[PDB]
């Protein structure tokens, strides 16, 4: 990272970043199977197994009601629209049965819908296996007062994933803001990331930033089919990496003239990214975040431009407003402020209270000289990388 404080205007330019873009999505559907538990019923008085069995039986009904309400006639709306479209495609019975038949003998099937998508499907059957094998044999003539506290603990430890999934899906009207550890486990996420069509470099980058991968995704509930739960979860795709890119952070350049303020604020602030073919521009601050030396922007909210970055449209997007404004431009390796406006501005330190009280005039700084900047008892934090 090389931050260049531009020497002839109050709007700096930077360079040296390597960019990664969100170029698509990878669908992934699951067939979490509860197992047949509606038959089992205990009437011996309150006990330990009874509470868990009732909890599971109520969670199933709650998920059924949530799915019934679901069918209505951090990320942009493109993600949710694509997810809704894929869910509508999956919902139909013919391909629901096709997926169920595909996931009958093995636990890995790269199937395909009526349209063209990668809907690699994985099934989990721990709860169903437990209920079918051990619980039915252990229960005998409807006797829930069995001294196997180990078995009760095993039931509590086994039904946890299904209970958590039901609660998470019910608490957010069928769509979850992000992918919890219960929705996809570590090994399953690693396999799903490694199986999608991207190069080895991007695969390694995602195997590193699993956290970002899991924060950018989401999941949608499909519906309840008999005695099973079917949901879908998407993983963001980073297709193009290692491109040079830059950010413009501009502030008004106001010069006091004994009452009259002559500011200069360009309107081209944002991240510019010259990939193969053109240069893209993301206006919103939420599109891009800084991950050390890299930057993560999503291509779904990009604008196209052709020739720029001369600081001089063609005479450059620049305004000449006469009304000044005070705030802090927290660049990754600095800060630029134009607080004149009869206000107080100063400099803070990580070990000394008050050093180098800030004068006005679109000031200058070399990162480490300060760690917090104050403007009339306001706290601003410098990202110390």
């Amino acid at each position: 990272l090389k931050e260049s404080y531009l020497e002839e205007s109050c709007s700096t330019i930077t360079e040296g970043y390597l960019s990664v873009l969100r170029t698509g999505w990878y669908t992934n559907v699951f067939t979490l199977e509860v197992g047949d538990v509606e038959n089992l019923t205990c009437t011996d008085g309150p006990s330990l197994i009874k509470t868990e069995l009732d909890l599971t039986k109520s969670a199933l009904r709650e998920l059924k009601t949530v799915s019934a309400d679901q069918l209505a006639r951090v990320a942009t709306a493109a993600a949710v629209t694509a997810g809704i479209a894929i869910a509508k495609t999956i919902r139909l019975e013919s391909e629901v049965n096709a997926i169920k038949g595909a996931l009958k003998t093995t636990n890995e099937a790269v199937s395909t819908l009526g349209n063209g998508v990668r809907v690699l499907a994985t099934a989990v059957r721990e709860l169903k296996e437990f209920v079918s094998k051990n619980l039915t044999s252990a229960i005998n003539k409807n006797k829930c007062d069995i001294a196997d506290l180990k078995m009760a603990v095993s039931f509590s430890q086994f039904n946890r994933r299904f209970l958590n999934v039901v609660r998470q899906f019910s608490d957010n009207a069928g769509i979850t803001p992000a992918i919890s550890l219960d929705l996809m486990t570590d090994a399953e996420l690693a396999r799903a990331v490694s199986y999608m069509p991207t190069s080895a470099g991007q695969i390694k980058l995602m195997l590193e930033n699993r956290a970002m991968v899991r924060r950018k995704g989401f999941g949608i509930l499909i519906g309840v089919y008999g005695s099973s739960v079917i949901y879908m979860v998407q993983l963001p795709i980073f297709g193009v990496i290692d491109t040079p890119c830059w950010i413009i952070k501009a502030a008004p350049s106001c010069s006091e003239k004994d009452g009259n303020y002559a500011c200069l604020l360009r309107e081209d602030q944002g991240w510019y990214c010259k990939n193969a073919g053109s240069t893209v521009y993301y206006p919103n601050e939420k599109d891009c975040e800084t991950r050390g030396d890299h930057v993560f922007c999503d291509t779904a909210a990009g604008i196209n431009v052709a020739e720029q970055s001369r600081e001089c449209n063609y005479p450059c997007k620049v305004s000449t407003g006469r009304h000044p404004i005070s705030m802090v431009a927290l660049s990754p390796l600095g800060a630029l402020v134009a607080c004149y406006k009869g206000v107080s501005c100063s400099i803070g330190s990580n070990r000394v209270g008050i050093i180098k009280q800030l004068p006005k005039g679109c000031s200058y700084i070399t990162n480490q000289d300060a760690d917090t900047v104050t403007i009339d008892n306001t706290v601003y934090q410098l990202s110390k990388v």
Partner: antibody
Amino acid sequence: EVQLVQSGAEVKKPGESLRISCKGSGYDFPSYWISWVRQMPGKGLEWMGRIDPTDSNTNYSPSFQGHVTLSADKSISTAYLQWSSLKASDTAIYYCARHSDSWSYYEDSWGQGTLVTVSS
Amino acid sequence: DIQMTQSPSSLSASVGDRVTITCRASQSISTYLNWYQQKPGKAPKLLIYAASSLQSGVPSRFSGRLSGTDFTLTISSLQPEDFATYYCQQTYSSPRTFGQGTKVEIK
């Protein structure tokens, strides 16, 4: 199994600097984010600092800013915390705590806890 | 800062009795919320994350509920092994804060 242990600095005179370390073991350092926390006796926990996974945000609480220099060290999987100016009110127990994956940011696998006192 | 107010400060209940603890947030934090349990002289252990889930290695009587900007922990059945202090913490973004704490005593 992630195991977190503490370091030893019991008594530190007023007007001096204190430093302790939390030697993480078992897991790897640069995969998920790490943080500190403290508790003076007879009160509730309050948050002090954190290091987001690779953002290196190294953010601190707004009140106790300009006083702490939380820093990581990838060399031997160790994190240190250094204090600028100790007062007669910062006596507490200092916990080192990890963070986790997923979206809810739940702190798990805490540390054993070390008591630090200020006195003449 | 996202202040938190916890209520009631301290309470006592018999064994096999439902206990409720309510945490209130100054501003909306959606569903990012965690609970904690700290026995005296020990490190806290995680109980509930995302205000509704259940972290591994925890008995199934610890259930939480969300209602807008109000959260609640409800112990299904108090047990003699449940004397501690319960906190609530938000994780909306940088930074994070805790609560004042609620003390639970048994009879």
